[PDB]
mmCIF file of C-alpha atoms and ligand atoms in Angstrom:
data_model
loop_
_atom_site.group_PDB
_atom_site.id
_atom_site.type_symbol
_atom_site.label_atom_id
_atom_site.label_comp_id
_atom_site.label_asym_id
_atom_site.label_seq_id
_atom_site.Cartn_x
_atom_site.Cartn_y
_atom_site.Cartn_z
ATOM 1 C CA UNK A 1 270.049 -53.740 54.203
ATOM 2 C CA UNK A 2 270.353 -49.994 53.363
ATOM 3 C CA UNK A 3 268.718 -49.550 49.630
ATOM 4 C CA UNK A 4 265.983 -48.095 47.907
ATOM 5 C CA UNK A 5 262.157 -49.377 48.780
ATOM 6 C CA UNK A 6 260.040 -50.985 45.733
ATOM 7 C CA UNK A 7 257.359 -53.089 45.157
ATOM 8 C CA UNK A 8 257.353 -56.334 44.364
ATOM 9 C CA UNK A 9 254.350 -58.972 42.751
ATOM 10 C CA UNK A 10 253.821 -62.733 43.664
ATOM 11 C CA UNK A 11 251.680 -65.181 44.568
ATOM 12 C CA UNK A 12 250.802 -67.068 47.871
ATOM 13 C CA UNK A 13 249.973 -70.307 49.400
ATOM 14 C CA UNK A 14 246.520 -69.780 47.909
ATOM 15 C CA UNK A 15 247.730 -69.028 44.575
ATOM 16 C CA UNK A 16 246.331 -65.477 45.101
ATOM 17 C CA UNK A 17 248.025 -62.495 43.854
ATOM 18 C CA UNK A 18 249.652 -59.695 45.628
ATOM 19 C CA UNK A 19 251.856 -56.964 45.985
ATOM 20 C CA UNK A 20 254.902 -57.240 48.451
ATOM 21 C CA UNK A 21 257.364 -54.430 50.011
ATOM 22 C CA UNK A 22 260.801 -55.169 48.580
ATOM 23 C CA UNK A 23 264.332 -52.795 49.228
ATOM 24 C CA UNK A 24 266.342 -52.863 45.869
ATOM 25 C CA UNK A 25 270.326 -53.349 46.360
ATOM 26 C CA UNK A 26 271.963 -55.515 43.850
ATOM 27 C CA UNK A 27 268.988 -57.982 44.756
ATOM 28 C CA UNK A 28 265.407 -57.494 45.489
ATOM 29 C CA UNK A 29 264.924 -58.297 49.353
ATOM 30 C CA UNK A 30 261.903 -59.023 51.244
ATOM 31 C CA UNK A 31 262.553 -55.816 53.111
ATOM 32 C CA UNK A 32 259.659 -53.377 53.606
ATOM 33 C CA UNK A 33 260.585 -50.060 54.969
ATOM 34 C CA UNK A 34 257.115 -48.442 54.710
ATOM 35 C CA UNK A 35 256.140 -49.917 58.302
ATOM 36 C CA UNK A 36 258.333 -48.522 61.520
ATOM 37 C CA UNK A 37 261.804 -50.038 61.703
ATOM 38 C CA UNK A 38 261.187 -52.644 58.842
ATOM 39 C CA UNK A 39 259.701 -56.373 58.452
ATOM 40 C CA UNK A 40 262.200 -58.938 57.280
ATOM 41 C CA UNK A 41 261.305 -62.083 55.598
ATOM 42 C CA UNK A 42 264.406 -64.583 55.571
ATOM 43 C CA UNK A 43 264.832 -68.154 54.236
ATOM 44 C CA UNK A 44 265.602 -71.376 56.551
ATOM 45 C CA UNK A 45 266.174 -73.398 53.621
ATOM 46 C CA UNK A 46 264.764 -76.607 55.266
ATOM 47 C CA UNK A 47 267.017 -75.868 58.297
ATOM 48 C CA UNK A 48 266.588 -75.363 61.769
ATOM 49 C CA UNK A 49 269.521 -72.498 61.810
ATOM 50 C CA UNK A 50 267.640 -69.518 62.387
ATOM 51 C CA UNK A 51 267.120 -66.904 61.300
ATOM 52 C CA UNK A 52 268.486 -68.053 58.007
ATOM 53 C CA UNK A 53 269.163 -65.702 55.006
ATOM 54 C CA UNK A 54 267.561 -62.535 54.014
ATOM 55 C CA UNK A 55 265.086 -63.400 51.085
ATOM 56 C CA UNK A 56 266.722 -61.918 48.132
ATOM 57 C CA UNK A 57 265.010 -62.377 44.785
ATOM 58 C CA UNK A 58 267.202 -61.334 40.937
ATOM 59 C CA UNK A 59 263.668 -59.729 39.214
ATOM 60 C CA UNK A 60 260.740 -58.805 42.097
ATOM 61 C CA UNK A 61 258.369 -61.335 40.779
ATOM 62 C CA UNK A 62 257.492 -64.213 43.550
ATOM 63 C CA UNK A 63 255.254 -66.663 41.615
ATOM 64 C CA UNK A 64 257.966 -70.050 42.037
ATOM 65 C CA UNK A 65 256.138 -72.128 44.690
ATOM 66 C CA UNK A 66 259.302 -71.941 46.823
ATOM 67 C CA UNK A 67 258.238 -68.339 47.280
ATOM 68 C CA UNK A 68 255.059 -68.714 48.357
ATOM 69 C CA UNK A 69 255.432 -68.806 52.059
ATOM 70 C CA UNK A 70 257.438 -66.099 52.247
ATOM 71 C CA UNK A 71 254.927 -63.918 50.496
ATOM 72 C CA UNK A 72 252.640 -64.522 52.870
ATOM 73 C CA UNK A 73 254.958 -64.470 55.874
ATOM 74 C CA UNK A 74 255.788 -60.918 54.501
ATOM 75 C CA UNK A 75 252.171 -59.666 53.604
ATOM 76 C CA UNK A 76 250.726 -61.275 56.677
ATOM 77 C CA UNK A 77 253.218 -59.228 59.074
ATOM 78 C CA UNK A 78 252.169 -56.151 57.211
ATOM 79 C CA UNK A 79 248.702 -56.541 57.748
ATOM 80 C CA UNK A 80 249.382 -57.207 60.985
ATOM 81 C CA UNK A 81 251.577 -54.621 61.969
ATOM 82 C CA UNK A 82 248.646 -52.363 60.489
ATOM 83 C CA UNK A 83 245.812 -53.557 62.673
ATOM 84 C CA UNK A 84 247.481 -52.769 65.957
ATOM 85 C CA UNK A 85 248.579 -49.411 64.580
ATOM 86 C CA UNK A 86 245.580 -48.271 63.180
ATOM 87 C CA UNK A 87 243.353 -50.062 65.344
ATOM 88 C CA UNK A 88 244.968 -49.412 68.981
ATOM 89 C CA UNK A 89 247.681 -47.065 68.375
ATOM 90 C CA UNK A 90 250.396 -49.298 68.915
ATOM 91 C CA UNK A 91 253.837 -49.724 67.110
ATOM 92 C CA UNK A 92 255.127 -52.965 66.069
ATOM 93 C CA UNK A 93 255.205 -55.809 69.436
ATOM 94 C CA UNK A 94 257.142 -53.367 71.693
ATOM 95 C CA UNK A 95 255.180 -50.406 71.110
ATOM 96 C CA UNK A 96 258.699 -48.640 69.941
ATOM 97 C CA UNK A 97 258.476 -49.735 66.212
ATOM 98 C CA UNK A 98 261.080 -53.249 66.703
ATOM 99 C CA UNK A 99 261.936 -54.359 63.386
ATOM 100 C CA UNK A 100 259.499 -57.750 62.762
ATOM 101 C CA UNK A 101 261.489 -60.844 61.490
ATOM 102 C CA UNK A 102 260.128 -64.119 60.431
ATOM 103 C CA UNK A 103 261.376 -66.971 58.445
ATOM 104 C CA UNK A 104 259.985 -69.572 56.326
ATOM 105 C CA UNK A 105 261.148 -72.913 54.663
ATOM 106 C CA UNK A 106 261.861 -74.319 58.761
ATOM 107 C CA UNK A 107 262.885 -77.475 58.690
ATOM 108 C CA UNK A 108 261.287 -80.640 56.712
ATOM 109 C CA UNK A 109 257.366 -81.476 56.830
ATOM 110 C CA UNK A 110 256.924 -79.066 59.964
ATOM 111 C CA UNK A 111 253.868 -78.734 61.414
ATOM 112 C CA UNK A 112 253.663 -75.689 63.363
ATOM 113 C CA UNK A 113 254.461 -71.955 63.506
ATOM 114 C CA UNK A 114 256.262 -69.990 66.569
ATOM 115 C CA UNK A 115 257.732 -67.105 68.097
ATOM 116 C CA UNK A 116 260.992 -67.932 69.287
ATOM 117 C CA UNK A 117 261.569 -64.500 71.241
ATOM 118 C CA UNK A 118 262.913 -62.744 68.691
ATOM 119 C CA UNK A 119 261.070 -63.727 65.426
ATOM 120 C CA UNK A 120 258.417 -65.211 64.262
ATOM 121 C CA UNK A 121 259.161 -68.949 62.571
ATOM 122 C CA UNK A 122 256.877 -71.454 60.049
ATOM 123 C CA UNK A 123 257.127 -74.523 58.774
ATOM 124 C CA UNK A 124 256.113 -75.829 55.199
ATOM 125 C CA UNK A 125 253.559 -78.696 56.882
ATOM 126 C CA UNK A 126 253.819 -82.381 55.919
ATOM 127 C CA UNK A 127 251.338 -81.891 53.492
ATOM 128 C CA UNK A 128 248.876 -83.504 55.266
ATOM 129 C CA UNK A 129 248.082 -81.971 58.293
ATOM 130 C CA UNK A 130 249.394 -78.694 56.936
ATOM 131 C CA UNK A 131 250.292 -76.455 53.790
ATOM 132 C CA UNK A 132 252.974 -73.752 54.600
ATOM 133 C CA UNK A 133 251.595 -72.206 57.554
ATOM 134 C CA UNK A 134 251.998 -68.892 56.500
ATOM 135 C CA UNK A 135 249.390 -68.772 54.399
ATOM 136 C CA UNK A 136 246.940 -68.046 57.335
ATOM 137 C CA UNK A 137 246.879 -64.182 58.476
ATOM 138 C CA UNK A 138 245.369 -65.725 61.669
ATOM 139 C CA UNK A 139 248.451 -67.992 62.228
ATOM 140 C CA UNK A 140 250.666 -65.159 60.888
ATOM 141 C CA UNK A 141 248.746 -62.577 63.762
ATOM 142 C CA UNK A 142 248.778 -65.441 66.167
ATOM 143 C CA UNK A 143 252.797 -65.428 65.778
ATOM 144 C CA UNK A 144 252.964 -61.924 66.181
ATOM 145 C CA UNK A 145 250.446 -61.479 68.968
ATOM 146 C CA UNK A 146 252.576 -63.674 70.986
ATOM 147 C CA UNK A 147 255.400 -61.337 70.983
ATOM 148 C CA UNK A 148 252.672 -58.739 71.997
ATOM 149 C CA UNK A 149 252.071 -60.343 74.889
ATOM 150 C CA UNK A 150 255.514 -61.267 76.056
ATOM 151 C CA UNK A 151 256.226 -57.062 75.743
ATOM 152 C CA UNK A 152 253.048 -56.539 77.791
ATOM 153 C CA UNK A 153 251.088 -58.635 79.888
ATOM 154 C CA UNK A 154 253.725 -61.254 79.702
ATOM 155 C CA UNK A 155 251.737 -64.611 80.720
ATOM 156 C CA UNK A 156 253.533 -67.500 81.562
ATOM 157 C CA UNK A 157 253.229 -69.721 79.277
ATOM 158 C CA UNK A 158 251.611 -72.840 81.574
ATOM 159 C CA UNK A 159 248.274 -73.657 83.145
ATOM 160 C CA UNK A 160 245.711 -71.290 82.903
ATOM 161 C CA UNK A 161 248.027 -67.818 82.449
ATOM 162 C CA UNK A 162 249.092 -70.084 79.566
ATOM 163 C CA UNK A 163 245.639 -70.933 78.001
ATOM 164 C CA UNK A 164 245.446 -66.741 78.474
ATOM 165 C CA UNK A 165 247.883 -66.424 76.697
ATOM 166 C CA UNK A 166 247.447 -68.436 73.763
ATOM 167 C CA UNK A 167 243.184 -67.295 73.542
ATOM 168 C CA UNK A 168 244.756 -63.654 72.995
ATOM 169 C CA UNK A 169 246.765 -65.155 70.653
ATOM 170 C CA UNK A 170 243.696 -66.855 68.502
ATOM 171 C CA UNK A 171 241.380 -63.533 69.947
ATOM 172 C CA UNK A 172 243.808 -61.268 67.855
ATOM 173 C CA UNK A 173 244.869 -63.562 64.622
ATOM 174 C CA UNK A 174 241.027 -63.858 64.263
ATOM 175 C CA UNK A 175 240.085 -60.067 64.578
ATOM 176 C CA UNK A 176 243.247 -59.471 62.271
ATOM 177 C CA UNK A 177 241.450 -62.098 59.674
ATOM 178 C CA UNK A 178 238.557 -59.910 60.161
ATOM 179 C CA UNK A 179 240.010 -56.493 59.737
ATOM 180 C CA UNK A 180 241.621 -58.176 56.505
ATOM 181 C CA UNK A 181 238.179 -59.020 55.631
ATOM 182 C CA UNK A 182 238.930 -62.335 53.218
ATOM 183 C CA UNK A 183 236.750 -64.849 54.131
ATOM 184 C CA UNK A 184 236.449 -64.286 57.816
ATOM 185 C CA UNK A 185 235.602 -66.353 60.477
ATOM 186 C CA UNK A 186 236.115 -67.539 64.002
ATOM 187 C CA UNK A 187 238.098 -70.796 63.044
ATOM 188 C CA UNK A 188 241.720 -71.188 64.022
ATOM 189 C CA UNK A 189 243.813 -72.007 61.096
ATOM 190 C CA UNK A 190 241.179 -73.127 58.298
ATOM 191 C CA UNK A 191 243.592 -71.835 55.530
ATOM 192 C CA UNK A 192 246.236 -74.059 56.007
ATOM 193 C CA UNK A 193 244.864 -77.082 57.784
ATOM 194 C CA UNK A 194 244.449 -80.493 56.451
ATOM 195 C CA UNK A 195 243.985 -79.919 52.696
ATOM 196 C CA UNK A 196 242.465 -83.089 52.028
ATOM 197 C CA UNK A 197 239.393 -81.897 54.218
ATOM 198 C CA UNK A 198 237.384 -79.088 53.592
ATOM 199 C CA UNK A 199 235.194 -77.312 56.510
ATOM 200 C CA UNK A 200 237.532 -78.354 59.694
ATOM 201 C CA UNK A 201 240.201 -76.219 61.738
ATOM 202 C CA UNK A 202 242.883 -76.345 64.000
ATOM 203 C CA UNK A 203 240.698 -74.795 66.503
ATOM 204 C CA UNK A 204 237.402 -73.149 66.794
ATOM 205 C CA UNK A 205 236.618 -70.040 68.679
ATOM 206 C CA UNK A 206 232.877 -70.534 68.287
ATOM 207 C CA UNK A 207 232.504 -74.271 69.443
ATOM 208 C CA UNK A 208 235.946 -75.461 70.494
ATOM 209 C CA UNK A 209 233.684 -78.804 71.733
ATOM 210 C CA UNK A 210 233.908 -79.743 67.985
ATOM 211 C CA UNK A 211 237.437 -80.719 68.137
ATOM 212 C CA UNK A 212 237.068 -81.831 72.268
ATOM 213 C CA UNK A 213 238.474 -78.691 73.516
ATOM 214 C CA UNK A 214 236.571 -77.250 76.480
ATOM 215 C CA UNK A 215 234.016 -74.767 76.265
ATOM 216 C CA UNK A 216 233.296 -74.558 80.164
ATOM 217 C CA UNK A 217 235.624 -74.025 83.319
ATOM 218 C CA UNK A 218 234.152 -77.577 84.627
ATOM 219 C CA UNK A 219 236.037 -79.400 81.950
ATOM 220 C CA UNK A 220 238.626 -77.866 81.881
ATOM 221 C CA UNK A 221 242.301 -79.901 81.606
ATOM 222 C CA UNK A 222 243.857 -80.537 84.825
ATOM 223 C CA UNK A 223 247.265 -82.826 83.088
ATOM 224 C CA UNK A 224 250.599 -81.613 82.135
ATOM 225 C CA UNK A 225 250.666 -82.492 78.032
ATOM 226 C CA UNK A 226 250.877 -79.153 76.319
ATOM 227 C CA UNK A 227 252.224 -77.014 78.980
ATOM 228 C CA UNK A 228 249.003 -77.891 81.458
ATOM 229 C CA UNK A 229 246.642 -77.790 78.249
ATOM 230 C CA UNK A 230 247.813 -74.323 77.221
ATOM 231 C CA UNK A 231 246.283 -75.044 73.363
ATOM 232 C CA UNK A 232 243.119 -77.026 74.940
ATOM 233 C CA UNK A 233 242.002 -74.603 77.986
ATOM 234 C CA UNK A 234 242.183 -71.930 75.223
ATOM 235 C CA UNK A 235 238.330 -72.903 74.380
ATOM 236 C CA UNK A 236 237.152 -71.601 77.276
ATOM 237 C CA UNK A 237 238.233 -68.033 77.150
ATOM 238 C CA UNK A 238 237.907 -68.195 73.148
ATOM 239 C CA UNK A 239 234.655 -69.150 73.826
ATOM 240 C CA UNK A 240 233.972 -66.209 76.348
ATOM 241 C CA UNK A 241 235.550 -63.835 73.672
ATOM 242 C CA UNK A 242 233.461 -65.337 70.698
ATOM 243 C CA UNK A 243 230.251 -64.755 73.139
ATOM 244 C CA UNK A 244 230.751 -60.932 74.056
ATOM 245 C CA UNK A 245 231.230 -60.001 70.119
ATOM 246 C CA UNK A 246 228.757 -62.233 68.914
ATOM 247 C CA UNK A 247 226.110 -63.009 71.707
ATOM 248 C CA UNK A 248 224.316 -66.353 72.442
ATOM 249 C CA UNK A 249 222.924 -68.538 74.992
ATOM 250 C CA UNK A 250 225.728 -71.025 76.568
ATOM 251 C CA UNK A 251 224.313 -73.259 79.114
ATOM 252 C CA UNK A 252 221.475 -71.544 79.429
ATOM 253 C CA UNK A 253 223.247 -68.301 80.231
ATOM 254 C CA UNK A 254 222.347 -65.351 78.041
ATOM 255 C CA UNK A 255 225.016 -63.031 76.206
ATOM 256 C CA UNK A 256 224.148 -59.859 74.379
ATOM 257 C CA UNK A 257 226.923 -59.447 71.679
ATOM 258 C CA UNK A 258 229.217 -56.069 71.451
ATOM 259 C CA UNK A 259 231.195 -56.615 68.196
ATOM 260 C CA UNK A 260 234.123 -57.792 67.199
ATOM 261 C CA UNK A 261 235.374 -53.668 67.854
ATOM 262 C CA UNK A 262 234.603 -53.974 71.581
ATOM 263 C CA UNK A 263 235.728 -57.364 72.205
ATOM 264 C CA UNK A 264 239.268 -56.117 70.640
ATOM 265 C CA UNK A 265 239.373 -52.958 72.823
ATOM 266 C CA UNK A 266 238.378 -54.299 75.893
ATOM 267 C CA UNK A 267 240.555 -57.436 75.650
ATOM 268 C CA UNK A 268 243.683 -54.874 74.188
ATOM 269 C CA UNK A 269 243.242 -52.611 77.274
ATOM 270 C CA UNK A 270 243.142 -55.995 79.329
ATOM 271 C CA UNK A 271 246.286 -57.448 77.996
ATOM 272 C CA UNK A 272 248.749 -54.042 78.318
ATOM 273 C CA UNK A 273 246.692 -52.787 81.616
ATOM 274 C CA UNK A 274 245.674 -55.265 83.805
ATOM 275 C CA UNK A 275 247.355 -58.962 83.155
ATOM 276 C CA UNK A 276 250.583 -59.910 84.785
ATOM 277 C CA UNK A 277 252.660 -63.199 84.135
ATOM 278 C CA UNK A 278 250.751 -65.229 86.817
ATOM 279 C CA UNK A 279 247.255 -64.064 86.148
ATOM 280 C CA UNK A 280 244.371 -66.977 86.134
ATOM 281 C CA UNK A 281 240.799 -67.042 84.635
ATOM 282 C CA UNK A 282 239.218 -65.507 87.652
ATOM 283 C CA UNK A 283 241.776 -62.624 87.193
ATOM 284 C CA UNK A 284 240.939 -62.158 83.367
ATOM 285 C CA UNK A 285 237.682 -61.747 84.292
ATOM 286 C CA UNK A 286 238.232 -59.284 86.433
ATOM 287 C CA UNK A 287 240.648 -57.328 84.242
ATOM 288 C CA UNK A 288 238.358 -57.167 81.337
ATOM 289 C CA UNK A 289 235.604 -55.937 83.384
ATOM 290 C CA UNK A 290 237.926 -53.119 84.495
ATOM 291 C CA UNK A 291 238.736 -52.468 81.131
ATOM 292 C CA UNK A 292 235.264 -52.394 80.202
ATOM 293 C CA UNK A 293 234.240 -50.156 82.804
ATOM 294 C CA UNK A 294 236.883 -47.750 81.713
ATOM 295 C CA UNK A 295 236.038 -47.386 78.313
ATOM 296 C CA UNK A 296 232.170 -47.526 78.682
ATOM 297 C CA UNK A 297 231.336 -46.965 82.219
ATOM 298 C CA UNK A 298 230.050 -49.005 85.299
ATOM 299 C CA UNK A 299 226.849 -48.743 84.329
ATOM 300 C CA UNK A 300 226.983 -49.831 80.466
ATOM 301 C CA UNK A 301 225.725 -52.730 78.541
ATOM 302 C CA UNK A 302 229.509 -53.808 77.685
ATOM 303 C CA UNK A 303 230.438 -54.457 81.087
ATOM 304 C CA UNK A 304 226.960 -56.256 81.597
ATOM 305 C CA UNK A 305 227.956 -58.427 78.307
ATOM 306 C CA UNK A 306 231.420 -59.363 79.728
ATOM 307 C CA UNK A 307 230.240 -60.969 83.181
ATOM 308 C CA UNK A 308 227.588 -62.768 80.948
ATOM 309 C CA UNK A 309 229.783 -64.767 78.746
ATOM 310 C CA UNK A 310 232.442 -65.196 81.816
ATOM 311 C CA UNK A 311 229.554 -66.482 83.560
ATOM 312 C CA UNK A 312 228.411 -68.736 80.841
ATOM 313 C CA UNK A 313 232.053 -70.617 80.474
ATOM 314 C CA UNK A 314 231.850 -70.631 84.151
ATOM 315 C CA UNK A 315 234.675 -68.260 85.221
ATOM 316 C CA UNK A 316 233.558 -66.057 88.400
HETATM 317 C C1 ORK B 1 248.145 -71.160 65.042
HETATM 318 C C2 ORK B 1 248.827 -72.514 64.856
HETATM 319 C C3 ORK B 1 248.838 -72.924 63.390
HETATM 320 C C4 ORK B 1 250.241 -72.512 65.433
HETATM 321 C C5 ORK B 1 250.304 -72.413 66.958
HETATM 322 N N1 ORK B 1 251.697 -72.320 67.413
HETATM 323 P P1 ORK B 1 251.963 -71.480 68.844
HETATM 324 O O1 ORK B 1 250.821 -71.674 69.783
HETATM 325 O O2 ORK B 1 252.365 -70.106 68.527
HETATM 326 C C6 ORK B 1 253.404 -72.396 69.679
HETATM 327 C C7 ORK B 1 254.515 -72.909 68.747
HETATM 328 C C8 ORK B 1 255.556 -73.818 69.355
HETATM 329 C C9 ORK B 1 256.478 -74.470 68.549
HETATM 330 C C10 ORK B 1 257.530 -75.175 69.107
HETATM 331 C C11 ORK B 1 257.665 -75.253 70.474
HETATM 332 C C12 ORK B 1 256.737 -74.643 71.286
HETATM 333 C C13 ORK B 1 255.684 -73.937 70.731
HETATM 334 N N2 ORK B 1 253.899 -71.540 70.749
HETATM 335 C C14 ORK B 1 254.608 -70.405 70.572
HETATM 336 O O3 ORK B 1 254.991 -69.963 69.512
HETATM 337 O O4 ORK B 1 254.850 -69.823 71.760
HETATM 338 C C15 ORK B 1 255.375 -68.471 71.712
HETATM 339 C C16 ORK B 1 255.596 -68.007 73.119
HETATM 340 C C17 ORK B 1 254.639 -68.224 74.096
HETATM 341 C C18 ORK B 1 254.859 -67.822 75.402
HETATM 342 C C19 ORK B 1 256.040 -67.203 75.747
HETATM 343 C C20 ORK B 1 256.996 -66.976 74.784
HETATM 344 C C21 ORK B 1 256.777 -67.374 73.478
HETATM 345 C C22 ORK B 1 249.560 -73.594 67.577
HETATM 346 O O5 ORK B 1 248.406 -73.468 67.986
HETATM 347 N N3 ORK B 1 250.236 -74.747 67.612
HETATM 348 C C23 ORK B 1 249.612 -76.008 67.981
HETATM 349 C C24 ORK B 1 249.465 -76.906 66.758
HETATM 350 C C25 ORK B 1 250.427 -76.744 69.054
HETATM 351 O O6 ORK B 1 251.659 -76.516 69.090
HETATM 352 O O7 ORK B 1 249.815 -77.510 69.823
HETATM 353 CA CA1 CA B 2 261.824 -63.858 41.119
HETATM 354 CA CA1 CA B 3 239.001 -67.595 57.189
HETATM 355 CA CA1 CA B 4 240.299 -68.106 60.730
HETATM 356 CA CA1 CA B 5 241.188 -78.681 55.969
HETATM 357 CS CS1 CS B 6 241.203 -80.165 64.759
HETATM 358 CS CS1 CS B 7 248.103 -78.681 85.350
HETATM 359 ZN ZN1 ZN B 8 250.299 -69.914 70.211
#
């Protein structure tokens, strides 16, 4: 909407305190026009009608608890939007500054979070298995990191192009949670998962084994549930990716750690450089050893690290 850009207060999913981009006309919308062409937080209302109404508030305070998620949604996205800027020079999902959209509230007791092509979309959770799933900035920067790779790389999203596709996705929501720097880790999802348990994840990055996801190409998922395992075969590359920042010995193969800085430029230059739709494990491997030899040389410890954690989650 064409107004005048303020600043609005509320709280999260958390119950933390923050301040939110709002555009002042008549209402106070979650509109912030300090990043490129705008991020827009709308309201689903508990439908599945997308993308819903543009969240329009009478006073620019957000502390109701039906305002939570789309705090979050909001902040998230900004954060976001500000790592792949300011970290790898890169404008919004398309490169060209496209206006980010989400919306919050979808549907009744949903337990997931998606891009749908156009926008990024959460559900509230049952309660159970989640709280309003906006409350992660890795699910948030998992959302939007799929749109990244549909404008890029754009891998199909099945079998093991798939399970590329959604490690990038984890890869980037976690370094986001990092660069955010609020209790980082290399979990998937912590934040918002099963608030009747503490300590446990969607996912893990570090030891997907400790949910059953694999952590080596021989056991890898071979079935058709979830798009050929698309969520499951994820471990193995997360696992690789965890490896080069952090280092460790997996399967008795040695990897000396990078940093999370490396990892994220090397796997960036691999997504928008090297990756196609169809491209497999074997082909990841080779495309981030590429894009480690191009940023660090032939000859350099980084491209050393990334054949030893491929090599460790058995990818040649
Ligand atoms: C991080 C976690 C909290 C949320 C995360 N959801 P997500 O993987 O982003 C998923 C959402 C979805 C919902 C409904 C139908 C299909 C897919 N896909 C998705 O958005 O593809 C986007 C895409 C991919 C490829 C090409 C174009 C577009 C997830 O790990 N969900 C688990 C529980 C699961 O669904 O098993
Ligand atoms: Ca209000
Ligand atoms: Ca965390
Ligand atoms: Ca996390
Ligand atoms: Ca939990
Ligand atoms: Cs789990
Ligand atoms: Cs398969
Ligand atoms: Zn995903």
């Amino acid at each position: 909407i064409t107004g005048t850009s303020t600043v609005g207060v509320g709280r999260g999913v958390l119950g933390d305190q923050k301040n939110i981009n709002t555009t002042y006309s008549t209402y106070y919308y979650l509109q912030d026009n300090t990043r490129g062409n705008g991020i827009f937080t709308y309201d689903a209302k508990y439908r599945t009608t997308l993308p819903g109404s543009l969240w329009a508030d009478a006073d620019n305070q957000f502390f109701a608890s039906y305002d939570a998620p789309a705090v979050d949604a909001h902040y998230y996205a900004g954060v976001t939007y500000d790592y792949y800027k300011n970290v790898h020079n890169r404008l919004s999902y398309d490169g060209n500054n496209a206006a980010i959209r989400s919306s919050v509230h979808y549907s009744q007791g949903y337990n997931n979070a998606f891009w749908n092509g156009s926008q990024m979309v959460y559900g509230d959770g049952d309660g159970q298995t989640f709280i309003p799933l906006s409350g992660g900035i890795d699910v948030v920067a998992h959302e939007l990191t799929h749109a990244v790779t549909d404008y890029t790389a754009g891998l199909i999203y099945q079998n093991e192009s798939g399970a590329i596709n959604e490690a990038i996705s984890d890869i980037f929501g976690t370094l986001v949670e990092f660069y955010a720097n609020k209790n980082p880790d290399w979990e998937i999802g912590e934040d918002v998962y099963t608030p009747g348990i503490s300590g446990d994840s969607l996912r893990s990055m570090s030891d997907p084994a400790k949910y059953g996801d694999p952590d080596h190409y021989s056991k890898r998922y071979t079935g058709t549930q979830d798009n050929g395992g698309v969520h499951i075969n994820s471990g193995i590359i997360n696992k690789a990716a965890y490896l080069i920042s952090q280092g460790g010995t997996h399967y008795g193969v040695s990897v000396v750690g990078i940093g999370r800085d490396k990892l994220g430029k090397i796997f960036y230059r691999a997504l928008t450089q090297y990756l196609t739709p169809t491209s497999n494990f074997s082909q990841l491997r080779a495309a981030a050893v590429q894009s480690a030899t191009d940023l660090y040389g032939s000859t350099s410890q980084e491209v050393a690290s990334v054949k030893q954690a491929f090599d460790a989650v058995g990818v040649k």
